[PDB]
Amino acid sequence: GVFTFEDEITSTVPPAKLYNAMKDADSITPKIIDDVKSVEIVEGNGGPGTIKKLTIVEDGETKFILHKVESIDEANYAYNYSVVGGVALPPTAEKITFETKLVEGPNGGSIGKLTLKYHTKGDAKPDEEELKKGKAKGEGLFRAIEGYVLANPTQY
Numbered sequence: 637g638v639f640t641f642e643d644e645i646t647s648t649v650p651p652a653k654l655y656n657a658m659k660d661a662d663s664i665t666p667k668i669i670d671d672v673k674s675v676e677i678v679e680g681n682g683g684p685g686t687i688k689k690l691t692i693v694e695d696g697e698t699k700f701i702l703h704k705v706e707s708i709d710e711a712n713y714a715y716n717y718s719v720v721g722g723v724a725l726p727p728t729a730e731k732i733t734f735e736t737k738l739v740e741g742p743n744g745g746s747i748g749k750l751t752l753k754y755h756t757k758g759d760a761k762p763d764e765e766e767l768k769k770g771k772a773k774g775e776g777l778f779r780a781i782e783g784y785v786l787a788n789p790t791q792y
């Protein structure tokens with residue numbers, strides 16, 4: 637089955653602008669996040685079903701993570717993807733889905749609605765520790781994109 641967790645975060649960047657930057661996560665992420673070295677398309681054209689391979693060098697040792705693009709809704713500022721392979725994925729999980737939806741902020745910013753879905757093998761409830769890592773990962777990407785936009789205002 638599926639275990640679901642919601643999280644909400646705010647930004648000072650307006651949603652249309654953040655969303656445009658998200659589309660460039662593949663090039664933005666390696667620059668901002670020290671451990672991320674590259675993001676490469678294994679299969680597909682960037683649309684749903686696309687598989688991406690992230691190369692990371694935590695410590696001094698290389699690691700791969702695999703993402704699958706699930707859906708996009710540009711009009712509603714949504715990007716959804718799943719972790720589908722790599723040591724990030726525990727054996728009790730078929731996949732971990734990260735959904736991001738941006739809405740308008742009261743003062744010219746955005747509200748990020750982050751949804752985390754764990755598809756477990758035999759309805760294995762996620763660990764306090766596992767979730768913690770998942771919450772941090774989703775929050776980390778959002779901050780990486782936001783940070784790039786705030787640091788490079790002419791870009792978007």
Ligand code: NA
Nearest residue numbers: 666669670672
């Ligand atoms: Na990097």
